[PDB]
Amino acid sequence: SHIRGLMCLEHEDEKVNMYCVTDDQLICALCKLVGRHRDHQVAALSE
Ligand SMILES: [Zn+2]
Numbered sequence: 546s547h548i549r550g551l552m553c554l555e556h557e558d559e560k561v562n563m564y565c566v567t568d569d570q571l572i573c574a575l576c577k578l579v580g581r582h583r584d585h586q587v588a589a590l591s592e
């Protein structure tokens with residue numbers, strides 16, 4: 546059983562990675578690699 550999670554919207558076989566503070570919208574690694582969220586701002590490790 547595994548019908549829970551906060552993966553990407555377009556990427557079903559890819560779980561999120563962090564939160565883009567610039568655009569203010571959660572994203573994944575595939576977005577930071579395929580998309581344009583590579584030079585954007587994020588937050589690693591919940592303070
Ligand atoms: Zn994605």
Ligand SMILES: [Zn+2]
Nearest residue numbers: 565568582585
């Ligand atoms: Zn972004």
